[PDB]
Structures are given as structure tokens and as C-alpha cells.
Design a protein around this ligand. Structure first.
Ligand code: HEM
Ligand code: HEM
Ligand code: HEM
Lengths: 727, 727, 309, 83
């Protein structure tokens, strides 16, 4: 109809722009030049739209897409309207089953590149040449909730990477915590059923705060390690860009000589580690249930590409038994103070998808998708995972040919004797559909193992024992890793952990379940146990108070790599600041604030009590991003209030509340000139306090103080001060 | 490896070769230069094989495809064998549901072209110019049987054509008889359940000769007309090349002025019409159940392209009620005496598929797929057909994106706002997935109806009446069309119809049902009635004898276009002759025989009592295509026995039976020199018999009498003489 | 309504009758007194028909099952005809994928009874008591052909028995020859692809007589033992009642003490062994493609019950 | 049918009518009912046409649509009164 506005304002600029600045859009419309080989091979299935006639699926042009065919304009719909019928039919079949676990996820395209050849330890082609680029597709996710639940729940996050190598798809399907809850895959369905919504009423969504989770945990102490991690701030990351990633299981690297090495896979966030605080995370599920999805997407459109360093913990075959814990036990971490992570390569995520359904929702990852140069181990959880995935994927995607869906295909077409199945797209021409054959001179052919481009051979690990359904006795230790984790956290991290356990156990209706969790916490650490106990109105028995603590892990009293914050790794590029305007902002302060933010790659959003524009003292017209209520403090990393007619907003409940919520959630607050009248709102002494930047104006110094606070992410020293303000 | 023979005799030549000369092969390897737009756009999905490494579906190379992974070479299979599991999994899911009806079918690629422009009567783009070449994909099929049943059963045949036009797909989904068994689609599941295998035990396959079929026919006299056609020789085609094709329903052609014309579609075989005889047909379901599928594929590989003339019966709107039957009643035909068929264009099938499953099994046809220039009518069977197809196709193929399976795709990409669904291949980039929208400037957009390239508009037919579940009174006449068909058949064709009803009714267990059918035949024609009654040991009653025959159809009393044979139209090109050899063949006859057959494009198969070769009297070395028992006479159109050492085979029971069988089935037999010794086996008088070529040697003249007989297909005058042939 | 004949000859006698005397019927109407534990528990799902009104799937009675709803008796069919839509819709979805292998098969219900207690060698509840009977469900089949293929082809036959024991279902999934064609399950799809119809033209149905099968056999000599049996008259049995059956693999019997014993399972036809000859078998696929299915069902209706040891 | 898995979704417990339904529809994925009707079509004489159509009436009758008069041309048009 030519409904677009005459001005071109409906379509974003195909260049990197700041979050909130332009309508977001499909990846290849937004960043047409961001390319790689996999992204280039997808061009054959991308479809355009502009300037085409509207058609049926069979190519017939549609004249009237507003009406059904009927006998009279007020008469009955006629069965012969095939156009109406195809439209409703497709719509009626849009949905597919969501993943059993990790149904909520957000994904992006990018590339990986190794720093140096790793040929001495692995013949994996993607690790052999630093001038070589392997396209990747990453999907991050939550675990428990549906595809439509909230992003910022407390939970473990999945972190799956598909590597389209030259010798096959390698999928590195890991999580954001280095261990899992259970030891043997046989218990996956019991554990997952316990954390998922309870069967009689399907409640609660996206939460482990319910009886069944804690019943299970209280009966299966192998779970306490990963439960500590989830109860901590690790359970509620600030963003997918600011969390670690782990393969979890011990795998094998295999070189050209046949030497096998043990490896654990790590991803280090180049943006540093950072998480929200519980009240903030919970509230954020209400105000913006898509916060992680949006943030990841907008980060990529702004050019703040999520960057991660692939790292390896390497353990020679001869040191297999040299630890306190079993290397093949997935509830056990390998302390970096014992086995350091070696830097291997870098992954950059620089393009969003075009169609979430087509690329994200249909993407299929599998930990069994390994390439020559890698191999498994006998880890019993990994071993049972090797059976799931493909199984579930055919159910979910419609057939065994789901490897032909565009996102899932290798960069080089495969050749084998597999035929038919639902929705077969390739048309095979080989005369032979079996091997060995003589009618196609045996093609395609087997390829011996070799140093490069050889066929897949499993490592000839020795196998010895009886056929038994038995847990290895070396896996029977459950409290020493949870304790190592506990001792490595800072004091404010310990309290957050205490509050995580306290909050969750309080949603457990059956009191005895709470008491049993407390009993288990008393086997990890007495100080942890007493503080949780106290929050539940429980007193430990004398016996509980004398439980002897678990042994150290290989003599360690702590390991600082396990804390999010003990060792500062801050980075503010990509963070965002809220700027509370008034109806006559001193433009001098605004100019100084925005330019300083911009120099460090920090984003800003101009907020007011209404939408539209406000005009600064010199006549500068300032466009408003969102209102105070519309873009709450939960969504920003810090707040700045410029001088101006402060009386315009000083009595605005939403304005004041904005600073109270941000102060409560430990965020840096900066007040310029008369904005300092808000100090009374958050009870700040005349003197001032650490975490509150204030001055007569927003000069250079003022912005450097604010940015330094931003580099340390939150104002932990404010904790005792927040207790009292009602917010 | 190198399993193929060093001579290179595993590969068939990429040139037209006669039936059984070379191993058959996928169309693209057999005839790589036979092309059309559709065939060329499928090129992006065709896969090679030669010279490729064997890989998983993820592209990982397989070293050993002979063995499962185990703990020790005599041990248990390990769950971690992802190669085995991938291979078994895909194998586990190969099969998809067969079509509910017309499961058994054979298909080929080709092209259509009009003879002249039809723009005075339709704006359909494919009919607009004789230079407009339209790619087609045709699927011929039986109706009742499963995907694995026999080709030469007695049954109706389906004849489906997919036209890939420049304005969308138009599927012409017809049968090989001009009417259907029932009038309203409400009864399709009742009719089909009655003809299909009975529910308690699932017998019988591919046969209407059981009680439920004949019970339903006896209780539903609307069925009698198509029943007549099925029981005639029309029900047992020689081949898909030698049968007619019909759309059955009256449709509409709409021109650019908006004028509507009623039309019925015809497909006229340029190879002419030909059918087997019942016992040959039933015997052939056991010696070669794939006969028709085989013959179609090999005709094409030989360059004997199946060719059909598209024909239209055109009826002015104003003539709607000018006949003594309803135009909209699908159990009524339109005699070509009353409304002649106008030749409109020709279709040629010239290329077999590459993979049966991918292109034939997954093909989807819909009578509802029409294009501007065409429209429906109120025919109640066609109307209800538009509630089916799509629905069934989504459960067979697996999803609402089956239009994206390569064979089903329109030549040019479609644009609409439909999204997702299982196995979505298209990656959409439109910022808008709805309309109207301003964010993509309302694209893709509607297009008004017009002369060419316009959107679809239904002809505005007036609808008047009450919402009722009621049969039109005009449709209640069930006997005059069956009688017209009966009076138009030759006397041997009449006799074949009697035998069909008699044979079928003999298999009905409940005698009362046999009598109810005979009672129906008495309403059609007394002679047919008595003849069937007599074969069942039934005596017509007094009352049945005085039944007045139904009225003539618009004065007609026969219509030679309804008979298969009344008007000679045979074609010998592509037929096959069996040549019975001996160890001392007279090479003077072979050359002459082969020189004469090849001049009229008749193929030959050299048959002996063992395989390998025989040596001619002059030393010519003859390769044997098959044995007498391996390639029985049922598979040829005529049998020739050249002179030589007849003593070598005169006492061969297989040789003698071959001629007795060919004789009984009315096929031409040629006997040279001492071959006239075989006359005794088929008891032929010394002066000879019309239909038995005999001469002193196989000269030109002898070959000419053989070719002339073959042009007449079968020797109808031998019928009375086969009675006393124990074969 | 009065469609059945007045004499009542539309209905088969509910008693053992010989082949072709009466129209065959569903077992429970043919032999209502026949019973076993599994046949009795299938009762809650069986449905009658006589004297019931015709209804939709939601229980709405149907008045006119002959016509679609339209605007005028000659007018267009309306989308609001929910009775027509349901009927066509269920019809449209009737078929399911056939089995990958063994798609063509015939089955029947029955019972098993051990001659004596086997507790010395196995703790299996179904072999512990001679007065204890186990309901079974057996399906015989060919291997290569589709569900609509012919019975008397030359092929191996499947012999599968479902034991409904008191401690769980035990399925004995065997064949009518004591060995299989291949050694490692990894090659099953290769082998099966070779015997099945060749990929380009989907020919030939229900036959191993084509190039790919013999090619595979010639390159894989492990197949020659089962090939020998298939090329013999074992490949074309007279009936499923007159062929042997085998588990093929060595399994294990475990007693209460934990003592293992190697075992191979066998089925002996009390009717003895009998096969057709090649030409009779091939012509039969043309004259009666359902010969073995018919024969089995008819033997049961006649009281000539398939018996196996 | 796509969501729940087949045309027999009326047989999932929660969806079943209180009184058994009877018709000639057969098969489909996950068929729970075991039909014993000798006939799977109508009209049939082998089960004396059961189950049968029931004429409409005041109580317990077959479904009959109201006979609304239909008048107009086949159009893809919004009624102007809806505007
Ligand atoms: C170390 C332990 C595990 C980790 C790190 C892990 C990780 C993941 C991740 C990240 C995903 C989502 C991938 C995506 O975004 O599509 C996922 C999905 C899944 N996981 Fe695992 N998982 C673990 C254990 C298991 C086990 C023991 C099983 C069962 C044997 C299992 C079964 C599944 C299934 C069935 C899916 C859905 C996949 C799909 O629908 O494509 N997981 N897992
Ligand atoms: C004049 C009457 C009819 C004719 C000539 C006819 C013709 C055909 C043909 C030729 C096919 C097979 C196409 C192929 O090769 O894939 C077919 C399939 C089919 N027909 Fe029709 N048919 C008729 C009536 C009906 C009716 C009344 C219905 C239901 C109301 C129906 C339902 C179907 C279904 C469900 C299929 C299977 C479609 C698929 O799975 O792709 N047919 N019919
Ligand atoms: C000793 C060798 C084997 C024997 C005796 C055997 C026997 C059978 C039988 C009798 C059936 C049909 C059962 C029925 O009536 O439903 C069958 C089905 C089947 N077999 Fe086996 N088979 C053998 C080897 C294999 C192997 C090695 C595989 C795969 C690795 C396999 C996969 C299948 C499949 C996929 C089916 C279809 C079953 C269904 O859909 O319900 N068979 N087999």
C-alpha cells in the first residue's frame, strides 16, 4: 500500500549503532558485510521480500489477503478458498516441541581462531593453524524453564558452541559452571524432573525454589557442589558476555603419533566476570523477561562483540590418579591452582541471526559430535549423554534428516549410504546405496586414520572389569569441593550464597526437607550452616556443630579463580548508564557525561517522566529514550543525574525510586550540582560516601570517578547500608 | 579399493539403449543432457559420490565401516560408538507413511507445450503461447494397493501431472477413466474402505474381488458406471503409455474479459490405447509385479518417450443445462459425439528421476493447486477434494513446509508471511511477518487480478439456496451411462466385461451379494445380465427380464471413442518381441528379423533355455537376454522363432509352454522354416491361421505380416480357439 | 435397515468351519469362547457396533451420512460442515510408516505352557511351572517386501513371539533359518539396502534377484550360509505352520544361584516341515498374493491351530 | 493432530466423550479402540448397516444444520456494514 513513512525512518542504518538507537533487525540486513564461510553458504536459503508480489506457497499471486471467499459478503465461507486454507494450515503447524532441557536460549554467529598450532598434542584440524578461521554458531541458555520463560532466573546456564571445521562439525556443549549436579546419566531424568515444574500443577517456572528439587538434593549429596555454584551469584549472571564457560567432562586430545592427553575445556569471558544480585535478578524477570536475549543482540549490533578465550586444562595420561578426586567424576572440578588453564584461541560473536526460528530454535548440538584429534573418556555422565541428543533431536525437528536444516549442515557436504527418511532434501545419484559395492567402484570410500584428513579411530583405551551396574567407589566423596568453593568466595559472596539457600529453602513447604538440607550444609561448612539455619529459625544440634569438616582438596585452603570477584577483571566497554534528565538540563554537564561514556565504549540512555523531547539550557533538543518506569534501574549498570532544573523531577516518585532501587542494588550513582538534593532520598551523609560520586559539576574528574566505580561493577562496601532503606 | 571390473562394465552407457541392453540408472547419469528449467534448478540438491570420502552426516570421515566399536574384538558394543548409532538411527527412520490411496505409483519428468495460444478462452499463462515450455512431473499409479503391491492388477489408474508454470504450480490430478465411482466426497472414506483390504485380516491386496466392494456397489448404484470401466479391459492397461487420462470434473477456464467456459480435461496417448487380457494381467502380477514401473523407466531410457496430447471438451456457460445429465455430476461422462475434444498441446516424458524416494515418493499433488485462468465448479466430489490432500501431505511428508522439498517447489521462489513449521529451510529476512505493515513498506504485496501476472480472483458465480445436506435430484440417474459404455464396446470387449464381473463375483463369498449385483446389471443391459448370471449359475427372474433399459444418452446408442479398440490406433514403436533361439540359429533370419523390427522401432529380447550365448549357423555369436522361464511371454507383445536346429528346443517344455501362453493371450506368433513344427503344440491347421505368421524363411514379407499384426495389438479372432488350449 | 438378507446368511457361524465355508471374521466374533489373560484384558478397548447410532468422534449423532453441507443442492460445499471435515480428516491420516524390514506379516494370538519346571537352569518365571500358561502374540513375516507385497516370495521369514509373562514381556524375535546373513549389526543397513529395491527406480519388490544383492553377497562371503538356506526350498514355505523358527543368537539362561548357561532357541512345527517349489511359489504371488496370511487365518478358524514346540 | 500426534486425539482420556462413539473411521497413529464391526463402510449389508444414521428430532436426533438462505456471488469481500 506504501505504508512506510516518507522519510526512511522505519528502517535502521546498516552500521553499528548503540542499544535503543534504532529498530533492531535481522543480522544480514543490519551488518551485510559481516561474513564468514558458513554465513556465506547460508545465502542460498535466505529469502528477500522487498518488491516481490505476495504469493501462495506454490507461487500463485494473491489479490486479496484481507478476506475469505464466501457466498455473499455476509455469507458462509466456502470450502474452495484454497488461499485461506493454506494460510491457516501453515499457521496451525508453526510450533515444534521445545528442547526437553535448555528450551530458553539466545544465539549468534561468529568465528574462532587458534593462537598457535596445537599439532604436538592434537591432530584436530581446527587447532592446527592460527591463520585459519573456523566459523562458529553459539547458543547460550537457561536449563529448567520453557522457551517462553525469563532470562534472569537463578539457574545454571548452558553454553554450546558449534565449530564448522574442515574435518567435520565439532560441538562443544558445556555450561557456565565447571561441574554438573549428578554423576551418572542414568539419573538425568530423576534430577531434571525434580528441578522442573511439579507434575500435578506445572509450577514453578524457571525456579529450583520448590520441594522436589530440595528433596532430591537432600537425598543425593553428589549434587551439593553444583548447588553451591547455583546458589551463589554465579546463578544469576549480568549477561552471557560476562560468565565463564566449561566443557565439564574430561575429554581426550589425540595427536598424529597416537599419544592421548586428558583435557578439560574452558571459555574465559574477555569482558570479565559479573553477576546481578538476587532481588535485582528476580525483579528483572518481571520488568524485562528478555533481558539476556536483548543485551546479547544489542551488544552485537553496537559492535561490542562477545569475546571469549578457549583454554585447556591438560593432564598427562600418567597423572590420571594423582588427585584427591576422580578425574572422570563430573561433580568434581580441577582447581586451576593445581592444573592451570592454557590459552588456546579466541572466539568472537559478530553477527546475529536473521530468523530466530530458522537458526536458533532449529539448531542442534551434540557432545558426541567430535572430530579426529578428540576423543571421549569413561566419565559416566558424558557416556550416557552420548545416547541422548540425536534421539531427542529427531523427535523435536521432525526427522533423521535434521542435519540438512541449513544451520546444522557441515561446510563441506557429506557423502555416505544413508537414504530416505522424512524430508530428504539431497537427491542421491550414486548407483550404490550400500557398501561394499562394485557398481560405483566402492565410492564413497573409507579413509584410514592419519595425521591430517584421516578417518576417525577411537583411542584404544584398555577396558577391564565385569559387566556391572556400579558406581566407582572413587566417586563417593561429596563435601570437599563444595567446601573449597565456599572458602574461595569473598565475604559478600558468602553472604549472597547464604541468602540464596535461605530464600530457596523458605519456598520449600515441607519443613523436614529444609532441615535435611541444613544437615547437609553442616557437612560442608559450619559457618555456612549456622547462617542458613538462623534464617530458617533452626538451631543446629550439638552433633551437627561437631561434624568434622571435609578434607582440603589436594591441600588447598582456597582457589581464587573460583570467585567471580576476588581478583578484579572488570571491563566497562558495553555497559550502559541511565541519565535522569530534567526539563532544563545544563548541557555542559550532559556534553561532558556523554563524551566520557562514549570514549570508553559505555552506552547511555536518556530518561524522563514522559516521552518526546526536552530542551537543554542552550536550546539543545534532547530526545528521550524511555521513561523512569519504562526503563528501570535494573536494566542499567549505573545512574547519573545531571544538574538542571532539578525541581522538575525532585518530587517525582519514579525519579526518586529509581535512585533508591539502584542504591539498593549496589550500583554506582553520580550526582551533579543541584542533583545532590537526591542525597536525602538515599540517606547519604553531607560528607558523602564511597560509591556516590558528587560534585558541583560533571567535569572530567567526576566522570573518571564514576567510570572507576563502573570498573569494579558494584559497590560491595554499601551492603550494610542497604539493609535499612525500604526499596 | 577397486571392486569394479577392469573392463568398466558396471557403468551403463550415457546414450539411449534398448530394454535390457544395459543396467538401468538414475536419469541424470543416464541422460545428463536431457534438461528443462525444473530439472536444472534441482541441480543444487543432486549429490555425487564418486571420488568422495565416506563421512558421517556431520562430515567426519569414517575409517572402518565394517565394525561396531567394542571392548575387545569378542566383547560388548560400546555406547560411545556414535558412527554406528548415527548409521542405525537413520536406517531406523527411513520409512514414511504411504499415500492413503494411490500408494503404488511410477513417475517421470518431462515438458508440455501448447499448439496455439488459448488467450481467447483462458488467461492461464502456460497456455498463452506455443513457445511457452512448461516443465512437468507426472505420477501414474494404481488406487487400491499398498506401495509394495503389483502393477498389473485390475484397478482404476491415477494420472497426476504437476505443471511448473511461471505463475505457479497447477496440478492436474486425474485418472484413466472419465468418471468416478461416487458423487459426493462425503462417501470417499466409505467407498475406499469397501475396496481396500478388509479390516479384520487385511486381505485382499490390490483387488476389488472381495465381498465388501461388491456389497457397497450393490447398495450404491451411482458406482455402476466406473465399475463398468474397471471390469472392462480399461482396468488392465498394457502400460501407462497406452492409456487415456481424464480430469473427470468439469472445471472453468476464465479469460481476461472475465468470461467463464466450462471444461473437461483429456490426455490422449500418442502411443495409442492398449490393454492386457485378464489372465495375462493376473499372471504378470506374479512373474513381474513391477512390470509397468519397469516398462515406463525403460521406454524412457530407450528414447521411447511417453507422449500425450492435452485435450479440452469446451462447454459454453449457456449450455450448462443442455444435456440430459448434470455437468457437475462426476459419475457422468460427456460423449465426444456431443462435445468433441479440442487438441490443445502435447506433453512428453523424457527423463526418469535420480532417486525414487526423494522425487517420486515425496511428490505432492493437489487438485486445489490452480492458477489464474482456471477455476473450480460446484461438482460435489471435486469440492470435497479441496478438504484433503494438503492435510494428508503434512502427516506423510512431516510438516507444513513440504512445499520446500525440491520436487514440490515452484520454479520461482514464493513470497508470503507464513513462518516456521518443522523443517523450515528458507531463512526469511523480512522485517515484517504480517501485513499490512509499514516497516517493510507492505511487501511482499497484493496484486490485482488482470490479464497476465495478476492475483487470483474467483469467478463470481451466483450462489442461491438453503444450507442443506442434500443430493441434487438431477444426479439421481445411474444406468444410462453404463449402458452407453456397454453398447460402444466391441463384441470381444463386451465378452471381456462379462468375464470380469463373472470372475469377480465368483470370489464374493456371500451369494446374496452376487445376486444383488446381477440384479443391477439387469437394469443396465439384459444381455450382459444373463451372461454374468449364467456364469454364476443364476437364473434371471421374470421381472428382471422385463426391466426396460434406461434411456439413450442424448440420442446416442454407442460412442466409438469409449471403446479401446473399435477404431484402430495402435503404435508398434516401443513394443517388444521375444525371439526364441536354438543352438544352430539360421543367421539369415535373425538379421532380417532384426533389420525389420528396428526399422519400426520394435525391441527384441533373445531368449534361450540357459544363459550365456549361442553360436549362429555362420558363427555369429548371440548373447542371451534371458531364459524361457525367466522372461515369460507375458512380458512381450509377440513371439518369433527363427529357423535353425529346432530339435534343440522342440521337446523343451518351457519353449512349448511359451508359445501356448502367447497363443492363449491372443499375441502374434511368427514361425520360420522348421519353426512351423511348433504349430502342433498350439494345434494350428496345415493351411494356417490368421494371426500365425508362417513362411519358408524370415524374409521381408514375413516380417511385414508380423509387424502389421503387432500394429493391431492382439488377434481378437483367436478368442473362440483358445478355449481348447490347456495353458 | 433391512440391508442384511432375511435368511441371515450375511453372518458367519460362530463355530469352527473349514476354509471357504463361511466369510472370515474378527476372532472375537468367530470364536467368542476362546480366551486367555491378554485376550481378556483387551476387552476394555474392544468396541461393538450393532444397535448403535452413527456418531462423530465427539459423540454427536449423524443424520445424513450421504451428503456434504452446501448452499443449494447443487451449490458449493460449506466450510462449516464439521461432520464432513472430521470424516475426511481421519481418513487422510489413516496410514503409518510400515516397518523398515519385515513390513509384510501375519499374526495371531495363542498360549504357551512349559512341559516341566526349568528352575534348575533358569529363574525365568514363564518356565517355572507346567500348570502356568503364558498368553502370546505371534507375527510371521517376510523381510524385503512392503506391507502390500506378496506372501509366497523367495525370502527369509521372520518369526516373532510376544510372551506376556507375570514378570514382564519377553519377545523372542526370530527367523525361520538358524543363521543370519551378516556378523556385525554395523552392516545391517548396507545389507538391507542391497536386498531391497534399488534406489533409482524402486524395483524390484520382494525379490533378491537383482544386481545389488548378488554384488553385496559376492563381496561379503559371510553372507553365503544364509544365502544357501534362502536359495533352497527353505526360502519358500508352504505355510507359516510348516517352517522351523530360531532365535539365531546364543543367549544366556540364568538360574537362582547365578549360574549361566549358553542357549540357542528353537521352534519345532508340530505340523512338520513343508515348502513349495519355485515356479509354484512365484505364480502364487500372482494368483493369491495373500496366500500365507489367508492360510494362517483359515487354519485357526477351522480349528487346525498352528502348534510349535 | 500435529500437536497431539495423530487423528486419534479424541481417544486421549481427557478428550473422550462420556458415551462411546461409533462410526466407520479406522486406523491412524496410536489407535486405542479395537473395532470388531465386520463392516468399515456404509451402507453395508454385512453388519445390517450398523452403526446407523438417526433422523433429527426433538431429543436424541441426528445433527441437522439450520436451513439458512444463502444468496450472493462468490466473493472475497468485507461486508460494508462491518466498516
Ligand atoms: C555435563 C553435563 C551436561 C551438560 C554440560 C549439558 C549441556 C547441555 C546444553 C548446553 C544443552 C542445550 C544446547 C542448545 O542450546 O541447543 C543441552 C541440551 C540437552 N541435553 Fe545436555 N547437558 C549435560 C547433561 C545431559 C545428560 C546427562 C543428558 C541425558 C542423557 C542430556 C540430555 C540433553 C538433551 C536431550 C538436550 C536437548 C537437545 C536438543 O533438543 O537438541 N544432557 N545440554
Ligand atoms: C474424481 C475423483 C478423484 C480423482 C480423479 C482422484 C485422483 C487422485 C490421484 C491421481 C491421486 C494420487 C497422486 C499422486 O500420484 O501422488 C490421489 C491421491 C489422493 N486423493 Fe484423490 N482423487 C479423487 C477423489 C478424491 C476424494 C473425493 C478424496 C477425499 C475427499 C481424495 C483424497 C485423496 C488423498 C487423501 C490422496 C493422497 C494424497 C497424498 O498423500 O499426496 N481423492 N487422488
Ligand atoms: C539375527 C538377526 C535378526 C533377526 C532374527 C531379526 C528379526 C526381525 C523380525 C522377525 C522383525 C519383525 C518383527 C515383527 O513381526 O514386527 C524385525 C524387525 C526389525 N528389525 Fe530385526 N532382525 C535381525 C537383525 C536386525 C538388526 C541387526 C537390526 C538393526 C541393527 C534390525 C532392525 C530391525 C528393525 C529396525 C525392525 C523393524 C521393527 C519395528 O518397526 O517394529 N534387525 N527383525
Amino acid at each position: 500500500d506504501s505504508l512506510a513513512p516518507e522519510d526512511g525512518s522505519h528502517r535502521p542504518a546498516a552500521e553499528p549503532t548503540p542499544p535503543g538507537a534504532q529498530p533492531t533487525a535481522p543480522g544480514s540486513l543490519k551488518a551485510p558485510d559481516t561474513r564468514n564461510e558458513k554465513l556465506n553458504s547460508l545465502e542460498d536459503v535466505r529469502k528477500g521480500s522487498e518488491n516481490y508480489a505476495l504469493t501462495t506457497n506454490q507461487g500463485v499471486r494473491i489479490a486479496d489477503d484481507q478476506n475469505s471467499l464466501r457466498a455473499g459478503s455476509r455469507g458462509p465461507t466456502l470450502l474452495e478458498d484454497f488461499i485461506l486454507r493454506e494460510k491457516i494450515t501453515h499457521f496451525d503447524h508453526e510450533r515444534i516441541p521445545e528442547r526437553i532441557v535448555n528450551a530458553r536460549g539466545s544465539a549468534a554467529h561468529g568465528y574462532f581462531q587458534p593462537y598457535k598450532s596445537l599439532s604436538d598434542i592434537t591432530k584436530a584440524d581446527f587447532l592446527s593453524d592460527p591463520n585459519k578461521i573456523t566459523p562458529v554458531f553459539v547458543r547460550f541458555s537457561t536449563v529448567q524453564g520453557g522457551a517462553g520463560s525469563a532470562d534472569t532466573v537463578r539457574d545454571i546456564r548452558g553454553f554450546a558452541t558449534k565449530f564448522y571445521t574442515e574435518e567435520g562439525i565439532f560441538d562443544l556443549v558445556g555450561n557456565n559452571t565447571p561441574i554438573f549436579f549428578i554423576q551418572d546419566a542414568h539419573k538425568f531424568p530423576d534430577f531434571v524432573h525434580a528441578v522442573k515444574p511439579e507434575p500435578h500443577w506445572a509450577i514453578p517456572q524457571g525456579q529450583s525454589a520448590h520441594d522436589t528439587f530440595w528433596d532430591y538434593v537432600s537425598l543425593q549429596p553428589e549434587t551439593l557442589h553444583n548447588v553451591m555454584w547455583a546458589m551463589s551469584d554465579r546463578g544469576i549472571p549480568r549477561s552471557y558476555r560476562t560468565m565463564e564457560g566449561f566443557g565439564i567432562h574430561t575429554f581426550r586430545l589425540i595427536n598424529a603419533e597416537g599419544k592421548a592427553t586428558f583435557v578439560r575445556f574452558h571459555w574465559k569471558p574477555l569482558a570479565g566476570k559479573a553477576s546481578l544480585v538476587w532481588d535485582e535478578a528476580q525483579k528483572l524477570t518481571g520488568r524485562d523477561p528478555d533481558f539476556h536475549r536483548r543485551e546479547l543482540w544489542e551488544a552485537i549490533e553496537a559492535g561490542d562483540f562477545p569475546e571469549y578465550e578457549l583454554g585447556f586444562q591438560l593432564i598427562p595420561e600418567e597423572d590420571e590418579f594423582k588427585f584427591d578426586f576422580d578425574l572422570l567424576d563430573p561433580t568434581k572440578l580441577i582447581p586451576e591452582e593445581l592444573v592451570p588453564v592454557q590459552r588456546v584461541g579466541k572466539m568472537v560473536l559478530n553477527r546475529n541471526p536473521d530468523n530466530f526460528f530458522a537458526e536458533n530454535e532449529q539448531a542442534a548440538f551434540h557432545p558426541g559430535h567430535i572430530v579426529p584429534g578428540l576423543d571421549f573418556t569413561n566419565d559416566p555422565l558424558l557416556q550416557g549423554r552420548l545416547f541422548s541428543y540425536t534421539d531427542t533431536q529427531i523427535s523435536r525437528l521432525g526427522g533423521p534428516n535434521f542435519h540438512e536444516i541449513p544451520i546444522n549442515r557441515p561446510t563441506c557436504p557429506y557423502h555416505n549410504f544413508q537414504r530416505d527418511g522424512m524430508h530428504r532434501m539431497g537427491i542421491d545419484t550414486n548407483p550404490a546405496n550400500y557398501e561394499p559395492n562394485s557398481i560405483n567402484d566402492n565410492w564413497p570410500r573409507e579413509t584410514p586414520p592419519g595425521p591430517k584428513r584421516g578417518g576417525f579411530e577411537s583411542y584404544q583405551e584398555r577396558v577391564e572389569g565385569n559387566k556391572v551396574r556400579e558406581r566407582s567407589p572413587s566417586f563417593g566423596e561429596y563435601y570437599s569441593h563444595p567446601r573449597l568453593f565456599w572458602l574461595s568466595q569473598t565475604p559478600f559472596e558468602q553472604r549472597h550464597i547464604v541468602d540464596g539457600f535461605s530464600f530457596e529453602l523458605s519456598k520449600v513447604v515441607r519443613p523436614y526437607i529444609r532441615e535435611r538440607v541444613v544437615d547437609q550444609l553442616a557437612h560442608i561448612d559450619l559457618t555456612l550452616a549456622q547462617a542458613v539455619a538462623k534464617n530458617l529459625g533452626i538451631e543446629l544440634t550439638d552433633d551437627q556443630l561437631n561434624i568434622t569438616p571435609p578434607p582440603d582438596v589436594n591441600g588447598l585452603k582456597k582457589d581464587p579463580s573460583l570467585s567471580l570477584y576476588a581478583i578484579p577483571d572488570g571491563d566497562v566497554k558495553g555497559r550502559v548508564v541511565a541519565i535522569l534528565l530534567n526539563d532544563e538540563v545544563r548541557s555542559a554537564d550532559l556534553l561532558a557525561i556523554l563524551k566520557a561514556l562514549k570514549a570508553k565504549g559505555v552506552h547511555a540512555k536518556l530518561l524522563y517522566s514522559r516521552m518526546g523531547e526536552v530542551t537543554a539550557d542552550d536550546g539543545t533538543v534532547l530526545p528521550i529514550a524511555a521513561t523512569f518506569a519504562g526503563a528501570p534501574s535494573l536494566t542499567v549498570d549505573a545512574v547519573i543525574v545531571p544538574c538542571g532544573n532539578i525541581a522538575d523531577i525532585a518530587d517525582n516518585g519514579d525519579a526518586n525510586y529509581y535512585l533508591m532501587e539502584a542504591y539498593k542494588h549496589l550500583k554506582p550513582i553520580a550526582l551533579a550540582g543541584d542533583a545532590r538534593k537526591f542525597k536525602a532520598t538515599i540517606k547519604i551523609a553531607d560528607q558523602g560516601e564511597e560509591g556516590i560520586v558528587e560534585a558541583d559539576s560533571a567535569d572530567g574528574s567526576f566522570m573518571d570517578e564514576l567510570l572507576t566505580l563502573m570498573a569494579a561493577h558494584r559497590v560491595w562496601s554499601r551492603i550494610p547500608k542497604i539493609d535499612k532503606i525500604p526499596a
